[PDB]
Ligand binder design. Structure first.
Ligand SMILES: *NCCOP(=O)(O)OC[C@H]1O[C@H](O[C@@H]2[C@@H](OC[C@H]3O[C@H](O[C@H]4[C@H](O)[C@@H](N)[C@@H](O[C@@H]5[C@@H](O)[C@H](O)[C@@H](O)[C@@H](OC(=O)CCCCCCCCCCCCCCC)[C@H]5OP(=O)(O)OC[C@@H](COCCCCCCCCCCCCCCCCCC)OC(=O)CCC/C=C\C/C=C\C/C=C\C/C=C\CCCCC)O[C@@H]4CO)[C@@H](OP(=O)(O)OCCN)[C@@H](O)[C@@H]3O)O[C@H](COP(=O)(O)OCCN)[C@@H](O)[C@@H]2O)[C@@H](O)[C@@H](O)[C@@H]1O
Ligand SMILES: C[C@@H]1CC[C@@]2(OC1)O[C@H]1[C@@H](O)[C@H]3[C@@H]4CC[C@H]5C[C@@H](O[C@@H]6O[C@H](CO)[C@H](O[C@@H]7O[C@H](CO)[C@@H](O)[C@H](O[C@@H]8OC[C@@H](O)[C@H](O)[C@H]8O)[C@H]7O[C@@H]7O[C@H](CO)[C@H](O)[C@H](O[C@@H]8O[C@H](CO)[C@@H](O)[C@H](O)[C@H]8O)[C@H]7O)[C@H](O)[C@H]6O)[C@H](O)C[C@]5(C)[C@H]4CC[C@]3(C)[C@H]1[C@@H]2C
Ligand SMILES: CCCCCCCC/C=C\CCCCCCCC(=O)O[C@H](COC(=O)CCCCCCCCCCCCCCC)COP(=O)([O-])OCC[N+](C)(C)C
Ligand SMILES: CCCCCCCC/C=C\CCCCCCCC(=O)O[C@H](COC(=O)CCCCCCCCCCCCCCC)COP(=O)(O)OCCN
Ligand SMILES: CC(C)CCC[C@@H](C)[C@H]1CC[C@H]2[C@@H]3CC=C4C[C@@H](OC(=O)CCC(=O)O)CC[C@]4(C)[C@H]3CC[C@]12C
Ligand SMILES: *[C@@H]1O[C@H](CO)[C@@H](O[C@@H]2O[C@H](CO)[C@@H](O)[C@H](O)[C@H]2NC(C)=O)[C@H](O)[C@H]1NC(C)=O
Ligand SMILES: *[C@@H]1O[C@H](CO)[C@@H](O)[C@H](O)[C@H]1NC(C)=O
Ligand SMILES: *[C@@H]1O[C@H](CO)[C@@H](O)[C@H](O)[C@H]1NC(C)=O
Ligand SMILES: [Ca+2]
Ligand SMILES: [Mg+2]
Lengths: 288, 494, 55, 330, 166, 27
């Protein structure tokens, strides 16, 4: 009713998000989409101060912000890949000057926060120059560069890439256009390959132990083929990591993880419910 | 210039039996190429439903969750009718290859979206109509190889299904007519249907371009004895436990239509306590109907200083003033007794005094009710009737249901009986439902017809007409299309 | 008449509480009283003993 | 040391008179939703619908108290599995991850290694089995094996198996995987008993064990530091006629040091971001389809001709017959 | 049925008596089962009233019931269960015969129908059937309802059914 | 409470095995 928010999300994605994810695409495939959620309310009511005439979200109240909005966000039932939600919150006219405070109680410069493995939320306050007019709703054309800087920094922090730790008496180069330096991508790929190989090894060991312990698990030819592919891929990935080829090692580890997960989580493994062993005499005695 | 717009409306029609029926519609039209991958920025149009069109090659998607059965004879023709339980019929694009695989994937995704057990849609439920369920939007060609229709008659609809449905609207029950959707009041009804319709429509009057429309509808019928309890006075507050306060800011049109036509009185109208913004008359469902419009976007009607509570005075009309029975209605039942054999008999009533019109009967019977097509008899006025077009596919045990489509010509002022014999089948002890003595539901039959109209209807503009008048394409001025669904049938197996 | 109507209303409400056809209890029985019954497995010997004479 | 919480709430009763179990599951669902667990991390499985059951005197409402005080079935309930898809096989697939590939993300338990998982199961049980919809049973051995598979795949950090049924202690007699602590409403020889008979609604609203679990959880806030011992002491023999039981040998941590919030709630970790990335006219119109094209419908199917056997077939049959006739008659 | 309980709220004991007096007077006036009055009163109480006309010729005159050829009409109204499709049914029938009896039964049936009509907790349709010629009307109605011609009774086709009777 | 499906070993297996073995084989 009081805000008419228009954002050039298409141009922002084309100019910043897509080049960033093209740089970051060595770790996998990325899907980008946007939505405008009307009447989406933060759970906690901001606290008011009579002095600064602005409303605040205390640090202890931050964890409860992202739970109510997730219901409106949904479930994304189309795909099962991990989802990273980056919300841009425009405060209502009731608490228009909304500011997030840190532990020390000072306002956050970026006015945003991020949650591990979930995403980030940025509070977008609107300038009073737009409010100078008494007519409502006022047109809000958000600034995409300022929002996207925070969102891409949060993406980097979420994906494990942190601030480079300079050795003593060292000078690091300026940021690139994409925002990611290539050697950081190499570290991320090393970590991804190692984690994928460890996950595949654990999955295969658990599958073998499950087969040993439980004797009513059905192993189909497809499951056997996937297990063989996973074992071959794990051995190849270990060999290439020993050799030094990170791209081939990463591809082999990805294939190993995919094959091991397909083999272990096949619905065909669970075929029939348990038949009691203390009731088979009623099945075999009467005729045989 | 935004490329999408939202129109919402609520039509309140008093029924001939003294009940009051209210139908919500929230139409969102988008001028985007959702059929091709790349549309990733959603406003108004829900993202949850937008990505389906591109992910699975879709042309038209129709989903309905319904409680109760529309009593056509006593309630009059409906704007929109749906079978009991879940109903999902979809139209895949010609570019698709594995229609059944996309059907299964889409059914599971829709189950996840709407919190309904739509994963039970299998080959045993799915049918491919040959002449029924034509596309409801713009269609270059009609190849039924790309059509799938499934119905789950035992599916229930509750708040668990209404909340995802309400969360797909832009206002999301915070403003507009969506605030009237109270779960307690909506299910305290004789009829309740939640529908989601996706189809392509003309972008402009020239209709040279494709625009995508989403129509979310909710139809309820309030009983005169349960809700009224002898009050004999209707109101928005008395119906929804809530009064309208503000229109949806996103909507470019939010109006309330109240039917005020008196069929017996000489040009008189029903009484509405607040004066309507305007009065609109047009040929809806074959009869000249007068509507009172409450434009919620007008400050002179509703604003921040007052709420809107539309009060309508309606009681069951006397026998003399009762409207004539609709020209087409049907009932379905099971003939015989025991647990060995029976008959699925359908009665098709043509009440028109002198006009005979064709009808299209669609029957889908599960595999355990083995049908004998040589026993199919269609007797109208006591003599054999030969259907113009008959298509029958036999069921395969645990793999296919029976499908039987007929194009029957109903003679004027007659009742046509369509009966086919079946033998109940004994299943394995693990193939029964947890309640095996309750019975098995036979899916409701679908009746498509072009019912003649009392007066001729002028060509209508879908962008300048009420949303209840643009549900079905109109081809002839003197005929309108109705899709009746009969009652579900409960049969017991040995 | 109010008491009779209350009994009928209670009977019909409890019947409405049924979620499936009546398959429990028994269908073949003899009633030596309003609240007593004899099932088929307990009165069948009466006929069987008489048929043993014929056999 | 956990950072993730999941909850699977299962009602295994499929008839109207079993209103207690649906009310129990919905009450636990509301408790864990207040305590901060997202609905996307809750796999709520209800065997039957009671809110919109046609026999419900108050439609679209499930009530927890005798005088219609609290409606657990509100307006933000997410029922993932309902009606006939709540079965033993489906529950085992949800637990062990061996779910059909087309199952949406809503109906999956995507729990990691660091995840504490709460399993609430109410229904009709017996000596070592819990009946699912009065047609199938999940034995203690089957549940133990499923939890063992979950442990070997390392998909739960710690598991809290709450069961509200007759002879509820018999279900966890065969548990052998570590980091599992189980709660029962009754011992192996006792029976779970109902609570709050409501004539107006017409059924029994809730069970004593779950009612008092809710009552104990109504005093629980995110700041609450209540240990699992106080949960073990809820509903003594004075109130619950059956005596509740538990096992904690499999759990590797002392229950006095385990907070109830660790299983019944999740608070999100929030980090203030202080970093920036420093960016720089078709002539032919379109037409709607005709809804009932009778003329096209009649002629789309080719003319029906009466079936007759092939001339080649009848000729071959007669040739064989006459060949045999001559081979017999000379 | 054993794990549930019901709180009866039937208070229409005077409506039943008034209906009984009206039905008795109209039956006396008509000389048979009053069809018009029954169909008007069922509409008034809110049922979905129907009428079936049956006929039969007995093999020989029946001295006890004083009938040779029997012609009658069955009046029944269906209480369509809200919140459910017409799939199940419960029948409350009054066997009415030419004996100046069961008027109180008819009145109580109509009062029960009036009480039941305003409720929402019905999962099954309720059929309030007022037969004619004692069990002959019941047999004709059942044969027509199930579409089985077991005894050779003649009857008009049924126009309204309430699903599978339970 | 309820009853799981359990075989009636004493009632039926013994009867239907002693109807075969002593009737035909052993004596
Ligand atoms: N909260 C808490 C809760 O509670 P609680 O606490 O827990 O508690 C409660 C609970 O409870 C419950 O409980 C449970 C339940 O249950 C329920 C259920 O239900 C159901 O079930 C049911 C059913 O239905 C029914 N049916 C029944 O059935 C039965 C069964 O089951 C059983 O098992 C049994 O009984 C059966 O039977 C049997 O088995 C039999 C067999 C054995 C024996 C055999 C024999 C041997 C041999 C013989 C002899 C030898 C030979 C030689 C000689 C010489 C069954 O029964 P029935 O069916 O009824 O029937 C029987 C039969 C039939 O019949 C027969 C007869 C025949 C005819 C005739 C014959 C022929 C004759 C010939 C002629 C003569 C000749 C002449 C010559 C001479 C000349 C001069 C010389 O059957 C059979 O099989 C039989 C057999 C056959 C055999 C053989 C053949 C014949 C003959 C031979 C002989 C002789 C001849 C020759 C010669 C002679 C002479 C010569 C000189 C030398 O059962 C039940 C009941 O019980 C179900 O469910 P439903 O619903 O259905 O479904 C569900 C799912 N879906 C189940 O499951 C359930 O469980 O409850 C109860 C109660 O109920 P009631 O209702 O009340 O009751 C009813 C009754 N009816 C209880 O009990 C229980 O426990 C629980 O569970 C819960 O629920 C609750 O909760
Ligand atoms: C002589 C010539 C030759 C031919 C012939 O004649 C001519 O020979 C004759 C002769 O040969 C006949 C046979 C003789 C032997 C007969 C055996 C008989 O079975 C026994 O029948 C008994 C009858 O009193 C008991 O069964 C009870 O039967 C009642 C009805 O009559 C039920 O009402 C009750 O069950 C009810 O269940 C619900 C509870 O709430 C109630 O309180 C309880 O009353 C049953 O009893 C139940 O029977 C069950 C078995 O079916 C369980 O045993 C159960 O026990 C419960 O078990 C629980 C754990 O599982 C426990 O927790 C609980 O406390 C217990 O109560 C037990 O209550 C008993 O029981 C059961 O065995 C069977 O019916 C018929 C039978 C074959 C006969 C058939 C006909 C014949 C061939 C005749 C035939 C013509
Ligand atoms: C109609 C005429 C047609 C004729 C056609 C004939 C064709 C068929 C003829 C013969 C088929 C033989 C079937 C039975 C053989 C062994 C079955 C068995 O005991 O399974 C035990 C059950 O445990 C128990 O409960 C045992 C209690 C009683 C055992 C009965 C003894 C019968 C042995 C002799 C019978 C006769 C054999 C030789 C006879 C000299 C243990 O087995 P299991 O591991 O639990 O089961 C898992 C199955 N896999 C995974 C192992 C595969
Ligand atoms: C001489 C020429 C022919 C003579 C006889 C011909 C005609 C005989 C035909 C029918 C007579 C057989 C009677 C049927 C027996 C029915 C009993 C029965 O079904 O009981 C049921 C249970 O039965 C059983 O458990 C097993 C029954 C085995 C029956 C075996 C004996 C039957 C016939 C034997 C001989 C009959 C007479 C012979 C004399 C010549 C139901 O039990 P319940 O009481 O409801 O439950 C209580 C707790 N369980
Ligand atoms: C011409 C005449 C001689 C016919 C001979 C009669 C027999 C056929 C009868 C006489 C005694 C009967 C038996 C009496 C007792 C029992 C126990 C009964 O088992 C139970 O107690 C029920 C168990 C259950 O319900 O699971 C099963 C039938 C049986 C074997 C009966 C089978 C039929 C028998 C052998
Ligand atoms: C049941 O069958 C009987 C006999 O087959 C039918 O009786 C005939 O009814 C017609 C009118 O429909 C009369 O013209 C005949 O004279 C009757 N014949 C006899 C022998 O009675 C009866 O109509 C059938 N009932 C139904 C409902 O179909
Ligand atoms: C990313 O997408 C491309 C094109 O759809 C596909 O070829 C590629 O395999 C995908 N990457 C992975 C890791 O699946
Ligand atoms: C609109 O607001 C004005 C100012 O409060 C009020 O006077 C007027 O009555 C309102 N409109 C209607 C239709 O009441
Ligand atoms: Ca969920
Ligand atoms: Mg039963």
């Amino acid at each position: 009713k009081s805000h008419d928010v228009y954002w050039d999300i298409e141009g922002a994605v084309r100019r910043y998000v897509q080049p960033f994810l093209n740089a970051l695409g060595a770790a996998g495939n990325f899907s980008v989409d946007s939505q405008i959620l009307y009447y989406a309310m933060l759970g906690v009511n901001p606290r008011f101060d009579s002095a600064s005439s602005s409303y605040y979200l205390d640090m202890h109240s931050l964890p409860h912000v992202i739970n109510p909005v997730e219901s409106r966000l949904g479930s994304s039932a189309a795909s099962l890949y991990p989802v990273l939600n980056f919300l841009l919150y425009v405060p209502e006219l009731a608490h228009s000057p909304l500011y997030i405070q840190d532990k020390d109680g000072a306002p956050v410069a970026t006015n945003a926060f991020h949650s591990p493995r979930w995403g980030g939320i940025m509070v977008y306050n609107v300038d009073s120059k737009t409010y100078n007019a008494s007519v409502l709703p006022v047109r809000v054309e958000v600034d995409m560069v300022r929002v996207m800087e925070v969102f891409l920094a949060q993406l980097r922090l979420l994906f494990g890439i942190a601030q480079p730790q300079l050795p003593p008496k060292c000078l690091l180069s300026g940021p690139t256009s994409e925002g990611l330096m290539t050697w950081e991508l190499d570290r991320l790929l090393w970590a991804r390959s190692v984690e994928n190989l460890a996950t595949a090894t654990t999955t295969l060991t658990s599958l073998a132990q499950l087969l040993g312990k439980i004797s009513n698990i059905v192993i189909k030819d497809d499951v056997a083929s996937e297990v063989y592919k996973a074992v071959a891929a794990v051995q190849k990935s270990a060999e290439e990591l020993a050799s030094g080829h990170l791209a081939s090692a990463f591809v082999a580890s990805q294939e190993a993880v995919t094959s091991s997960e397909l083999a272990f989580f096949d619905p065909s493994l669970l075929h029939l419910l348990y038949f009691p062993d203390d009731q088979k005499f009623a099945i075999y005695i009467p005729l045989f | 210039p935004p490329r999408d717009s939202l129109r919402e409306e609520l039509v309140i029609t008093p029924l001939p039996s003294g009940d009051v029926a209210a139908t919500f519609q929230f139409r969102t039209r988008w001028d985007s190429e959702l059929q091709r991958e790349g549309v990733s920025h959603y406003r108004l149009f829900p993202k949850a439903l937008g990505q389906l069109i591109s992910k699975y090659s879709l042309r038209e998607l129709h989903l309905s969750f319904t409680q109760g059965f529309w009593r056509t004879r006593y309630w009059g023709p409906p704007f929109l009718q749906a079978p009991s339980g879940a109903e999902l019929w979809v139209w895949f694009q010609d570019t698709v290859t594995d229609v059944d695989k996309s059907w299964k994937e889409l059914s599971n995704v829709l189950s996840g979206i709407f919190c309904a057990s739509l994963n039970f849609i299998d080959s045993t439920n799915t049918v491919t109509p040959t002449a029924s369920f034509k596309p409801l939007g713009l269609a270059n060609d009609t190849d039924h190889y790309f059509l799938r229709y499934a119905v789950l008659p035992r599916e229930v609809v509750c708040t668990e299904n209404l909340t995802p449905w309400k969360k797909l609207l832009p206002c999301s029950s915070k403003a507009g007519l969506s605030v009237l959707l109270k779960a307690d009041r909506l299910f305290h009804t004789s009829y309740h249907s939640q529908a989601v319709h996706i189809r392509p429509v003309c972008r402009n009057a020239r209709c040279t371009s494709i625009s995508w429309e989403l129509r979310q509808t909710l139809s309820v019928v309030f009983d005169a004895f349960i809700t009224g309890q002898g009050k004999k006075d209707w109101s928005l507050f008395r119906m929804f436990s809530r009064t309208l306060t503000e229109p949806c800011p996103l909507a470019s049109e939010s109006r309330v239509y109240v039917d005020i036509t008196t069929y017996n009185q000489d040009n008189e109208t029903l009484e509405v306590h607040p004066p309507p913004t305007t009065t609109y008359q047009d040929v809806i469902l074959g009869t000249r109907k007068t509507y009172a419009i409450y434009d919620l976007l007008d400050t002179a009607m509703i604003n921040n200083s007052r709420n809107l509570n539309i009060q309508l005075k309606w009681k069951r009309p006397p026998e003399n003033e009762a409207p004539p029975v609709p020209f087409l209605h049907a009932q379905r039942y099971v003939s015989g007794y025991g647990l060995q054999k029976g008959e699925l008999s359908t009665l098709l009533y043509n009440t028109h005094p002198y006009r005979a019109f064709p009808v299209l009967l669609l029957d889908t019977v599960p595999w355990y009710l083995r049908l004998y097509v040589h026993t199919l008899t269609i007797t109208s006025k006591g003599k054999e009737n030969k259907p113009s077009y008959i298509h029958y596919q036999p069921a395969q045990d645990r793999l296919q249901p029976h499908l039987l489509e007929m194009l029957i010509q109903l003679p004027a002022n007659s009742v046509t009986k369509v009966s086919i014999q079946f033998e109940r089948a004994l299943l394995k002890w693990t193939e029964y439902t947890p309640d095996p003595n309750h019975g098995f539901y036979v899916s409701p039959s679908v009746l498509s017809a072009l019912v003649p109209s009392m007066v001729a209807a002028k060509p209508v503009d879908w962008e300048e007409s009420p949303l209840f008048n643009s549900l079905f394409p109109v081809s002839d001025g003197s005929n309108y299309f109705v899709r009746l669904y009969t009652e579900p049938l409960l049969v017991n197996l040995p | 008449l109010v008491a009779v109507g209350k009994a009928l209303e209670g009977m019909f409400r409890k019947l409405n509480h049924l979620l499936e056809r009546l398959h429990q209890s028994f269908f073949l029985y003899l009633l030596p009283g309003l609240s007593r019954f004899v099932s088929i497995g307990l009165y069948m010997p009466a006929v069987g003993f008489l048929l043993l004479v014929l056999g | 040391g956990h950072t993730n919480n999941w909850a699977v709430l299962v009602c295994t009763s499929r008839f109207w008179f079993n209103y207690r179990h649906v009310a129990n599951t919905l009450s636990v669902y509301r408790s864990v939703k207040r305590l901060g667990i997202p609905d996307s991390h809750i796999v709520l499985m209800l065997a039957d619908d009671m809110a919109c059951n046609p026999r419900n005197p108050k439609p679209a409402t499930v009530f927890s108290h005798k005088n219609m005080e609290l409606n657990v079935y509100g307006d933000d309930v997410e029922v993932d599995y309902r009606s006939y898809e709540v079965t033993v096989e489906n529950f085992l697939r949800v637990l062990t991850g061996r779910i059909p590939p087309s199952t949406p993300r809503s109906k999956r338990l995507l729990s990691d290694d660091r995840s504490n998982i709460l399993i609430y199961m109410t229904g009709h049980g017996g000596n070592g089995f819990l009946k699912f919809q009065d047609s199938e049973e999940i034995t203690n051995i089957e549940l133990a094996d499923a939890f063992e598979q979950m442990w070997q795949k390392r998909r739960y950090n710690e598991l809290l198996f709450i069961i509200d049924t007759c002879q509820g202690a018999s279900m966890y007699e065969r548990f052998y995987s570590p980091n599992i602590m189980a709660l029962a409403s009754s011992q192996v020889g006792e029976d779970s008993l109902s609570h709050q008979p409501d004539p107006a609604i017409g059924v029994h609203l809730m069970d004593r064990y779950t009612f008092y679990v809710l009552e104990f959880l109504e005093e629980i806030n995110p700041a609450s530091q209540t240990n699992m011992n106080d949960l073990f002491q809820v509903c003594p023999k004075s109130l619950c006629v059956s005596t509740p039981g538990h096992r904690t040998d499999l759990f590797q941590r002392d229950p006095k040091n385990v907070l109830i919030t660790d299983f019944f709630g999740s608070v999100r970790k929030v980090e203030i971001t202080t970093e920036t990335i420093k960016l720089q006219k078709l002539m032919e119109p379109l037409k709607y389809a005709e809804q009932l094209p009778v003329a096209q419908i009649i002629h789309q199917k080719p003319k029906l001709k009466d079936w007759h056997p092939p001339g080649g077939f009848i000729l071959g049959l007669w040739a064989l017959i006459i060949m045999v006739f001559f081979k017999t008659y000379g | 049925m054993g794990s549930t309980m019901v709180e009866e709220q039937f208070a229409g004991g005077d409506r039943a008596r008034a209906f009984a007096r009206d039905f008795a007077a109209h039956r006396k006036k008509s000389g048979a089962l009053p069809v018009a009055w029954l169909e008007r009163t069922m509409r008034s109480v809110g049922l979905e009233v129907y009428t079936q006309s049956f006929s039969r010729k007995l093999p020989f005159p029946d001295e006890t019931h004083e009938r040779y050829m029997v012609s009658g009409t069955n009046v029944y109204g269906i209480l369509r269960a809200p919140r459910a499709a017409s799939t199940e049914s419960l029948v409350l029938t009054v066997p009415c015969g030419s004996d100046s009896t069961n008027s109180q039964a008819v009145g109580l049936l109509l009062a029960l129908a009036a009480h039941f009509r305003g409720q929402i907790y019905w999962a099954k349709d309720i059929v309030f059937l007022v037969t004619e010629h004692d069990l002959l009307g019941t047999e004709a109605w059942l044969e027509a309802y199930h579409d089985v011609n077991v005894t050779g009774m003649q009857s008009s086709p049924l126009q309204g059914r309430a699903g599978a009777i339970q | 409470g309820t009853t799981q499906l359990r075989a009636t070993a004493t009632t039926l297996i013994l009867c239907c095995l002693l109807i075969i073995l002593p009737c035909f084989i052993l004596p």
